[PDB]
Design a protein around this ligand. Structure first.
Ligand SMILES: CCCCCCCCCCCCCCCCCC(=O)OC[C@H](COP(=O)([O-])OCC[N+](C)(C)C)OC(=O)CCCCCCCCCCCCCCCCC
Ligand SMILES: CCCCCCCCCCCCCCCCCC(=O)OC[C@H](COP(=O)([O-])OCC[N+](C)(C)C)OC(=O)CCCCCCCCCCCCCCCCC
Ligand SMILES: CCCCCCCCCCCCCCCCCC(=O)OC[C@H](COP(=O)(O)OCCN)OC(=O)CCCCCCCCCCCCCCCCC
Ligand SMILES: CCCCCCCCCCCCCCCCCC(=O)OC[C@H](COP(=O)(O)OCCN)OC(=O)CCCCCCCCCCCCCCCCC
Ligand SMILES: CCCCCCCCCCCCCCCCCC(=O)OC[C@H](COP(=O)(O)OCCN)OC(=O)CCCCCCCCCCCCCCCCC
Ligand SMILES: CCCCCCCCCCCCCCCCCC(=O)OC[C@H](COP(=O)(O)OCCN)OC(=O)CCCCCCCCCCCCCCCCC
Ligand SMILES: CCCCCCCCCCCCCCCCCC(=O)OC[C@H](COP(=O)(O)OCCN)OC(=O)CCCCCCCCCCCCCCCCC
Ligand code: SF4
Lengths: 80, 175, 156, 318, 70, 98, 115, 105, 69
C-alpha cells in the first residue's frame, strides 16, 4: 500500500491531507483522556438557579450553606 | 403608529406576495420574493428569532439567485412582462392589492375581522411575555439542541439530502 | 458683477476637472496604435496626467483615431463616436487619420477621419512619436482649459 | 446624535474610497516601473477630486432597450448595501453591536450580488448578460466554502458576535492555530469581490467592460465606490477575524491605529496580488473551490469541531 | 521614488482613523463618560431597565451609589 | 387570534391561488411553491417563538431543508423538459392525453 | 430603532447621488447614442434569447449544499450542551454524509461542465 | 395501520418534541406549561370520547392560554370604552398612566 | 425576583383600580373578572399590564431589547 500512497501523494496531495486530517479528527477524541474534563466543565456551568430543597430532617449530602465543606466543589477546574 | 411595526411589515409581506404570485415574469417574481423574504425576516426578527430570520434570508437569497440564473438560461421570452405588459397580470395584481388594502381598512375600523378564523385588530405587542430569559436566547438553545437530542431528525435529514444528491445525478442523465 | 465672477470660477473648476481627468478609449487601427502604446509605456507615462484608457465608449472622454480609417470601418467608428457621452473630443493622429497618408488615392480608404467625425486636434507624423502625441494631449488639455461654457450661458 | 455618528461613519469611507483609487493607481504604477498621477496637485493629491467632479457632470446615457426601473435600482442597491454593511464592524466599538453580526455580513454579502445580476440583466446587451452569468458562477463557486470557513474559524471564538472576537485574540493571534483557514479565507475574499485574479465580471480582456458596459458616468461611479468600499470592508473583516489587536478600554485609539495599519497592509497585499497574476478562467475558478478548497474545508471543520472537546478548551458563549 | 505612495496612503490612514474613534468619543459623550453598555442577553437588558428606573432622571448612565440608602 | 397571523395566512392563500391558476410557465409555479413554503415557515416560527416552545425550534429550519428536497428537484424536472422542447411552456406537456 | 435609521440614511445618500447625476449636467439625447453597444456594429438577434447554461448540475448541488451546511451553523452553541459525545457523533456524521455526497458527485463526473 | 415500533423496542425517537411539557433544554418552561400539564393529566388513559366532554374545562383554559382570544376581547372593550370617554371629555387619565409614575425600583 | 414580583403586582392593582372608574355605566360588566376557569396564578400578559399607558413605555418595554442597537 506504500506504492498507492506515494502515487496518490504525488498526484493529488490535497485529498491525502484532507483524509489524514479527517482520520485524526475521527480517531483522536476516543484516545485523549480530556473529554471527561469537557463533560464536567460543561455540566459545572450554572445557567439556572440552584433551587433549594426543603429540610425534611435526613439529608446528609447537601449542605445548609454554600461555604460548608459538603457539596460539589471545582478545585479541579481551578487546578486543571 | 410605531406600535404597529410588525403589522406594517406584514402588510409589505402580503404586498410582495401579491406582487410575485401574479406571475409577470420570473425575474420580477424573484425580486418580489426577495422583498417578501426580507420583510419576513424582519417580522421574525421583531419576534426575537434573529438567527432564524437571518438563516431564511440567506437561504432564500441563494435559492432566488440560482433561480434567476435558470430563468436567464432557460425560461426567457423576447418581450418579458414587467407588470403592465399583460392585461391579466396587471388586473390580478390590482385586485390583489385592492383586497389586501380592503382587509386592512376593515380591520383598522372595528378592530375585529372574521375571515374563516376570527382575528383581532390590536397590535401584536400585547401577546409578548413580560419576563426575562436569563443569559441565553431560547431560540438559540432550541436549535442547538438538534444534535444533543434530535439524533433521529439529523439522521433522516442527512439521508434525505444524500438521496436527493443521488436523485439529481440520476434524473439529469439522458440515458 | 458678482454673478460673472461666480460663473467664471465655476467654469474654471469644471474645465480643470474635465481636463485633468481625460479618459481615452482603447481604440487603435494600425502603426500609430503601437506608438500610442509606447506613449503608455513607463517612459512617457500618460497616467501621470490623469490619462487612463477605458475599454467602453460609455465611460470614456476622448477618442484617439490612430491608424487608417478604411471604407469597411467608417460606420463602426461613427457608431463608436456616437455612443460616447458629451462632452466628447477626438484627437486625429498620424497621416492616415489626417488626410489618407500613404493611401490617399486608394479605392477603399477614407481620406481623413474629418469626413466622418468632428476633430479637435490634428497630430501630424508617420508615426507621430510618443513625445509628439503627449504634446498633442497637452494641447488638447490647454484647449479644454480655455473653454467658456458657463460664461456664454450667462451672456446668452 | 445618532445621525452624527452615521454621517461620520459614511463620509470618511467615501473619502477612503477616493484615496484608495489614488493609492491603487500610484502603487500599481510603481510596481510597473513607472509613476502614478502627480501633475494634478502636490504628489497627485487632487486626482480623485478631479475624477469625481468629472464623472458627475457627464451625461447619464440611459439606454432605450433597457428596463429603466431596474437600471436605476441596481446601482442604488449596490451603494446602499455597501454602506449599511460596514456597520457591525467593531472599530473597536461597532456602530451597531449586533449579536449575530457574522451572519448579517454573510447575508448582505449574498444580497450585493443581485445588484450585479440586475445590472447585467437590465441593460439589454449580450456582454452584460455574460458578466451577470459569470457573477452567478462566481457566487456558486465561492459562497459555500466561504460559509464553512467562517463556521470552522468561529468554533474557537464561541459565538457569532464580532465584538467578542477581540477578547478571543487577546492572548495570541487567530492566524497561528488557523492559518490554512486564513489562506483559504483570503482567496475567498479575493474571489468574493470580483478582484483579480478572479475579476471575471468587469473583464476588459474577454469582454469590453462586462455588466457595467452600458452604464455611463454618474451611475458608473456608484459601482466603483461600491467595489472599493467592499474591498476595504473585506480587509477590515479579515483583520478582525485573524489579526486581532491589543485593545485597551481606556485608550481605543491604540486599537484604531493598530487595525488601521493592518487593514492598510491587507489592501496593499490586495493590490500586490492584482498586479502580478493572470486572470483565472471562470470554469477553472469553479473547479478550484469545489474540488481543492471544499474537501480541505470539510476536514478542517471536523478537526475544529473535534478539537476543543479533545482538549477541554470549549470557549464560553457569554 | 516609492515613498511618494506614502503621502496618499497616510491620507487613507486618516480616512480609516476618523470614523471608529469618533464612535468611541460618541460613546463617551452620551453615556456620561463611560462605555456604552452592551445588552446581548435579556438579563443585561433587565439590569439596564432597572438602572434607568432607579436613577430617577430616566437616564440609565446616572449611577446612584451606596449614599442613596440609609 | 392576533393580526400578523391573519396577514401570514392571507399571504399563504394569495400564493395558493397564484399557484393553482397556471400562466403557461413552469418557473412561475416553482416560485409560487417557494412562496408558500416561506409563508408556512414564517407562520410556524411566529407561533413557536410566541409560545416559547424552545425544543420545537429544530422544526422550522429542518423544515426549510426539505424545501430544497422538492424545489431543486423541480429544477431537475425542468431541464429534461427544456431538452424535450425549446421552451418550458406547460401547454407542451399534453402528450399524455390519449 | 437605530437600524432602520441607518438603512434610511444610507438609502437616501445612495438615491441622492443619481438625481444629482441626472438633473445637473447638460444632456443631448439622439437616436444613435443610446443604442446597445456591440463594438461598433449593430448586434445580431436580441439579448433576451435563451442563454444555454452548462453548470446546471453544480447549481442544483449548491442549492442543496447551502442549506445542508446551514444545518451545521449552530455547531458553536451545540458545544455548550451537557451531552457532548452524542453531539460530536452527530456532527461528524453530518459532515461525513456531506463528504460522501461530494465524493459521489466527483466520481460520477457530475462536477464537469456539459458540452 | 400504526405499527408502534418505538414502545416495542423502547427506543425514543420523537416523543421529546411532541409536547411542550417534556424535557426542555436548561429547564426552559413554556408559557402555558401548567395548563398543558393539567390537561394531559386530566385526559390520561380515559379515552378521547370521554376526554372530549369530561376534561373540557382544562382544555378550554389551555386553548385560552395559547391564543388569548378572550383577553384580547376584554382589552379591546376596555380600550374602546376609554377612547369613547376621552372623546366625550368625561374621563381624564391618571398621572401614573401618563408617564410621570415613579415605578418601584 | 422580589422587586419584579412587587412591580407587576403594583401594575396589576393600578390597572384594576382604574378599570372600575373607566367602566361603571356599561351594562353586564364585572370588574376584575378572570378569563380562566381556574384560580391558579398565571403569568401576566403584556397587554394586561401596559394596556392603559402611553406608547413610549410600550416601545420601551415590549420592543426595547430587540431594538437596542
Ligand atoms: C490571511 C493571511 C494571508 C493569506 C495569504 C495571502 C498572501 C498570499 C497570496 C498568494 C497569491 C494567491 C493568488 C490566488 C491563487 C489562486 C489559486 C489557489 O489558491 O489555488 C489553491 C490550490 C489549488 O490547487 P491547484 O489549483 O493547483 O489544483 C491541483 C489540481 N490537480 C491536483 C488535479 C492537478 O491549493 C489549494 O487548494 C491549497 C489550499 C491551502 C492548503 C493548506 C494546507 C495546510 C497544511 C495541511 C496539512 C499538510 C500535511 C499533511 C497532513 C498532516 C496531518 C498531521
Ligand atoms: C460628489 C462629486 C460631485 C458633486 C456635485 C457636482 C459638483 C459641481 C457642480 C457644478 C458643476 C457645473 C454646473 C453643472 C454642469 C454644467 C455643464 C455644462 O457645460 O453646462 C452648460 C450649460 C449651458 O449650455 P446652454 O444652455 O447654452 O446649451 C448649449 C447646448 N444647446 C444650445 C444645444 C442646448 O449650463 C447649464 O445648462 C447650466 C449649468 C449651471 C449654471 C449655474 C447654475 C447656478 C450655480 C450656483
Ligand atoms: C425594492 C427593492 C428594495 C428597496 C429597499 C431596500 C432597503 C434596504 C435593503 C437592504 C437591507 C435589508 C435588511 C433586512 C433585515 C436585516 C436584519 C438585521 O440586520 O438584523 C440585525 C440585528 C440582529 O441582531 P439581534 O441578534 O436581533 O440583536 C438583538 C439584541 N441586541 O437586528 C437588530 O439588532 C434589530 C434592529 C431593529 C430591527 C427592526 C426589524 C427589522 C427591520 C427591517 C426593515 C425592512 C427590511 C426590508 C428588506 C428588503 C430587501 C429587498
Ligand atoms: C377566488 C379565486 C380567484 C382569485 C383571483 C380572482 C381575480 C384574478 C383572476 C381573474 C381571472 C383571470 C385569470 O385568472 O385568468 C387565468 C390566468 C391564466 O390565463 P392566461 O394564460 O394568462 O391568459 C388566457 C386567459 N386569461 O391565470 C392567472 O391570472 C393566474 C394569476 C392569479 C393570481 C391570484 C392572486 C391574486 C390575489 C387573489 C385573491 C387572494
Ligand atoms: C464668491 C466666491 C466663491 C465663488 C464660487 C467658486 C468657489 C470655488 C470653486 C472651485 C475653485 C475654482 C478655481 C479652480 C482653479 C482655477 C485656476 C486653475 O485653473 O489653476 C490651474 C492649476 C494647474 O495649472 P496647470 O495648467 O495644470 O499647470 C500645468 C502643470 N505643469 O490648478 C491647480 O493648481 C489646482 C487647482 C485646484 C482647484 C481647487 C481644488 C478642487 C476643488 C475642490 C472643492 C470642490 C470639490 C469638493 C469635493 C467634491 C467631491 C470629491
Ligand atoms: C481626510 C483628509 C482628506 C484630505 C483631502 C484633500 C487632500 C489635499 C489637501 C490640499 C493639498 C494642497 C492642494 C493645492 C492645490 C493647488 C493650489 C494652487 O496653487 O492653486 C492655484 C490656483 C491658481 O491661482 P493663481 O491665481 O494662478 O495664482 C497666482 C500665483 N502667482 O488657484 C486655485 O486653484 C484657487 C484656490 C484653490 C485652493 C485649493 C486648496 C485645496 C483644497 C482641497 C479640497 C479639500 C480640502 C480639505 C477638506 C477636509 C478638511 C476641511
Ligand atoms: C476514514 C477517513 C475519513 C473519511 C471521511 C471524511 C473525508 C474528508 C474529506 C472529504 C473529501 C471529499 C472528496 C473526495 C473525493 C474522492 C473521489 C475522487 O474524486 O477521486 C478522484 C481522485 C483521482 O483524481 P481524478 O480521477 O483525476 O479526478 C477528476 C478530476 N481531478 O482519486 C484520488 O485521488 C484517490 C482518492 C481515494 C484515496 C485517498 C487516500 C488518502 C490517504 C490518506 C492517508 C491515510 C488516511 C487513512 C484514513 C482512511 C482513508 C480511506
Ligand atoms: S500614419 Fe504612418 S505610422 Fe500611422 S498608421 Fe498610417 S502608415 Fe502607420
Amino acid at each position: 500500500v506504500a506504492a498507492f500512497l506515494k502515487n496518490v501523494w504525488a498526484k493529488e496531495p490535497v485529498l491525502v491531507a484532507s483524509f489524514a486530517i479527517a482520520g485524526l479528527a475521527v480517531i483522536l477524541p476516543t484516545l485523549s483522556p480530556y473529554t471527561k474534563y469537557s463533560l464536567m466543565i460543561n455540566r459545572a456551568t450554572p445557567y439556572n438557579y440552584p433551587v433549594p430543597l426543603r429540610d425534611d430532617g435526613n439529608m446528609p449530602d447537601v449542605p445548609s450553606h454554600p461555604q460548608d465543606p459538603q457539596g460539589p466543589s471545582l478545585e479541579w477546574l481551578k487546578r486543571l | 403608529m410605531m406600535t404597529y411595526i410588525v403589522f406594517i411589515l406584514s402588510i409589505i409581506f402580503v404586498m410582495g406576495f401579491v406582487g410575485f404570485s401574479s406571475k409577470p415574469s420570473p425575474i420580477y417574481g424573484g425580486l418580489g420574493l426577495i422583498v417578501s423574504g426580507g420583510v419576513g425576516c424582519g417580522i421574525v426578527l421583531n419576534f426575537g428569532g434573529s438567527f432564524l430570520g437571518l438563516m431564511v434570508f440567506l437561504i432564500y437569497l441563494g435559492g432566488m439567485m440560482v433561480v434567476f440564473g435558470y430563468t436567464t438560461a432557460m425560461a426567457t421570452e423576447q418581450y418579458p412582462e414587467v407588470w403592465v405588459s399583460n392585461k391579466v397580470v396587471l388586473g390580478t395584481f390590482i385586485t390583489g392589492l385592492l383586497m389586501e388594502f380592503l382587509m386592512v381598512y376593515y380591520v383598522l375600523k372595528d378592530k375585529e375581522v372574521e375571515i374563516v378564523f376570527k382575528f383581532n385588530g390590536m397590535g401584536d405587542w400585547v401577546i409578548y411575555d413580560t419576563g426575562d430569559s436569563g443569559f441565553f436566547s431560547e431560540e438559540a438553545m432550541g436549535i442547538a439542541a438538534l444534535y444533543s437530542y434530535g439524533t433521529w431528525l439529523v439522521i433522516v435529514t442527512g439521508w434525505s439530502l444524500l438521496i436527493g444528491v443521488v436523485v439529481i445525478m440520476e434524473i439529469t442523465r439522458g440515458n | 458683477s458678482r454673478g460673472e465672477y461666480v460663473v467664471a470660477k465655476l467654469d474654471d473648476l469644471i474645465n480643470w476637472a474635465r481636463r485633468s481627468s481625460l479618459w481615452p478609449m482603447t481604440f487603435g487601427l494600425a502603426c500609430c496604435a503601437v506608438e500610442m502604446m509606447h506613449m503608455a509605456a513607463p517612459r512617457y507615462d500618460m497616467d501621470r496626467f490623469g490619462v487612463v484608457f477605458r475599454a467602453s465608449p460609455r465611460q470614456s472622454d476622448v477618442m484617439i483615431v490612430a491608424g487608417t480609417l478604411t471604407n469597411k470601418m467608417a460606420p463602426a467608428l461613427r457608431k463608436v463616436y456616437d455612443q460616447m457621452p458629451e462632452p466628447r473630443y477626438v484627437v486625429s493622429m498620424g497621416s492616415c487619420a489626417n488626410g489618407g497618408g500613404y493611401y490617399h488615392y486608394s479605392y477603399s480608404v477614407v481620406r481623413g477621419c474629418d469626413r466622418i467625425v468632428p476633430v479637435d486636434i490634428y497630430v501630424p507624423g508617420c508615426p507621430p512619436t510618443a513625445e509628439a502625441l503627449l504634446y498633442g494631449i497637452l494641447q488638447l488639455q490647454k484647449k479644454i482649459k480655455r473653454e467658456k461654457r458657463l460664461r456664454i450661458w450667462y451672456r446668452r | 446624535m445618532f445621525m452624527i455618528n452615521v454621517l461620520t461613519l459614511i463620509i470618511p469611507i467615501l473619502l477612503a474610497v477616493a484615496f484608495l483609487t489614488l493609492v491603487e493607481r500610484k502603487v500599481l504604477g510603481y510596481m510597473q516601473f513607472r509613476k502614478g498621477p502627480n501633475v494634478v496637485g502636490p504628489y497627485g493629491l487632487l486626482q480623485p477630486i478631479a475624477d469625481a467632479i468629472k464623472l458627475f457632470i457627464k451625461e447619464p446615457l440611459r439606454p432605450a432597450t433597457s428596463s429603466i426601473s431596474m437600471f436605476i435600482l441596481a446601482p442604488i442597491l449596490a451603494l446602499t448595501l455597501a454602506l449599511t454593511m460596514w456597520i457591525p464592524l467593531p472599530m473597536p466599538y461597532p456602530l451597531i453591536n449586533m449579536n449575530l453580526g457574522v451572519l448579517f455580513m454573510l447575508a448582505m454579502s449574498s444580497l450585493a450580488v443581485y445588484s450585479i445580476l440586475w445590472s447585467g440583466w437590465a441593460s439589454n446587451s449580450k456582454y452584460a448578460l455574460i458578466g451577470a452569468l459569470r457573477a452567478v458562477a462566481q457566487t456558486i463557486s465561492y459562497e459555500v466554502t466561504l460559509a464553512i470557513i467562517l463556521l470552522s474559524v468561529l468554533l474557537m471564538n464561541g459565538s457569532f458576535t464580532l465584538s467578542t472576537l477581540i477578547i478571543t485574540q487577546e492572548q495570541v493571534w487567530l492566524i497561528f492555530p488557523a492559518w490554512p483557514l486564513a489562506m483559504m479565507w483570503f482567496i475567498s475574499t479575493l474571489a468574493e469581490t470580483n478582484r483579480a485574479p478572479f475579476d471575471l465580471t468587469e473583464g476588459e480582456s474577454e469582454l469590453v467592460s462586462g455588466f457595467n458596459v452600458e452604464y455611463a458616468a454618474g451611475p458608473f461611479a456608484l459601482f466603483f465606490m461600491a467595489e472599493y468600499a467592499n474591498i476595504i470592508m473585506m480587509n477590515i473583516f479579515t483583520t478582525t477575524l485573524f489579526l486581532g489587536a491589543f485593545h485597551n478600554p481606556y485608550m481605543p485609539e491604540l486599537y484604531t491605529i493598530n487595525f488601521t495599519i493592518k487593514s492598510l497592509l491587507l489592501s496593499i497585499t490586495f493590490l500586490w496580488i492584482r498586479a502580478s497574476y493572470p486572470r483565472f478562467r471562470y470554469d477553472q475558478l469553479m473547479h478550484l473551490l469545489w474540488k481543492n478548497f471544499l474537501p480541505l474545508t470539510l476536514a478542517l471543520c471536523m478537526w475544529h469541531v473535534s478539537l476543543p472537546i479533545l482538549l477541554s478548551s470549549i470557549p464560553p458563549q457569554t | 521614488m516609492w515613498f511618494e505612495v506614502l503621502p496618499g496612503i497616510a491620507v487613507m490612514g486618516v480616512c480609516l482613523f476618523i470614523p471608529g474613534m469618533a464612535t468611541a468619543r460618541i460613546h463617551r459623550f452620551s453615556n456620561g463618560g463611560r462605555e456604552k453598555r452592551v445588552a446581548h442577553y435579556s438579563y443585561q437588558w433587565y439590569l439596564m431597565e432597572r438602572d434607568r428606573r432607579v436613577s430617577g432622571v430616566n437616564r440609565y448612565y446616572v449611577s446612584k451609589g451606596l449614599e442613596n440608602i440609609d | 387570534m392576533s393580526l400578523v397571523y391573519m396577514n401570514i395566512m392571507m399571504a399563504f392563500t394569495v400564493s395558493l391561488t397564484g399557484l393553482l391558476m397556471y400562466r403557461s410557465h413552469l418557473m412561475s409555479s416553482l416560485l409560487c411553491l417557494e412562496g408558500m413554503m416561506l409563508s408556512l415557515f414564517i407562520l410556524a416560527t411566529l407561533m413557536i417563538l410566541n409560545s416559547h416552545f424552545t425544543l420545537a425550534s429544530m422544526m422550522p429550519i429542518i423544515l426549510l431543508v426539505f424545501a430544497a428536497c422538492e424545489a431543486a428537484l423541480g429544477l431537475s424536472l425542468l431541464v429534461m423538459v427544456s431538452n424535450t422542447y425549446g421552451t418550458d411552456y406547460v401547454q407542451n406537456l399534453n402528450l399524455l392525453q390519449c | 430603532m437605530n437600524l432602520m435609521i441607518t438603512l434610511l440614511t444610507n438609502f437616501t445618500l445612495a438615491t441622492l447621488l443619481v438625481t444629482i447625476a441626472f438633473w445637473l449636467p447638460q444632456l443631448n439625447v439622439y437616436s444613435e447614442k443610446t443604442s446597445p453597444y456591440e463594438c461598433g456594429f449593430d448586434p445580431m438577434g436580441s439579448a433576451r434569447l435563451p442563454f444555454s447554461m452548462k453548470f446546471f448540475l453544480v447549481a442544483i448541488t449548491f442549492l442543496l449544499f447551502d442549506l445542508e451546511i446551514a444545518l451545521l451553523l449552530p455547531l458553536p452553541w451545540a458545544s455548550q450542551t451537557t451531552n457532548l459525545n452524542t453531539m460530536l457523533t452527530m456532527a461528524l456524521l453530518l459532515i461525513f454524509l456531506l463528504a460522501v455526497s461530494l465524493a459521489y458527485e466527483w466520481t460520477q463526473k457530475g462536477l464537469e461542465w456539459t458540452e | 395501520p400504526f405499527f408502534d415500533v418505538q414502545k416495542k423496542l423502547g427506543v425514543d425517537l420523537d416523543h421529546w418534541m411532541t409536547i411542550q411539557s417534556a424535557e426542555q433544554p436548561h429547564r426552559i418552561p413554556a408559557r402555558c406549561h401548567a395548563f398543558e400539564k393539567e390537561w394531559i393529566e386530566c385526559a390520561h388513559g380515559i379515552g378521547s370520547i370521554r376526554a372530549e366532554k369530561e376534561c373540557k374545562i382544562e382544555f378550554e383554559d389551555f386553548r385560552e392560554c395559547l391564543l388569548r382570544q378572550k383577553t384580547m376581547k376584554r382589552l379591546n372593550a376596555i380600550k374602546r370604552q376609554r377612547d369613547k370617554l376621552i372623546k366625550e371629555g368625561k374621563y381624564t387619565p391618571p398621572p401614573h398612566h401618563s408617564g410621570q409614575e415613579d415605578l418601584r425600583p | 425576583q422580589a422587586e419584579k414580583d412587587r412591580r407587576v403586582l403594583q401594575m396589576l392593582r393600578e390597572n384594576l383600580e382604574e378599570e372600575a372608574t373607566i367602566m361603571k355605566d356599561v351594562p353586564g360588566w364585572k370588574v376584575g373578572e378572570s378569563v380562566f376557569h381556574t384560580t391558579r396564578w398565571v403569568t401576566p400578559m403584556m397587554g394586561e399590564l401596559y394596556g392603559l399607558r402611553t406608547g413610549e413605555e410600550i416601545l420601551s418595554s415590549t420592543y426595547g431589547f430587540i431594538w437596542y442597537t
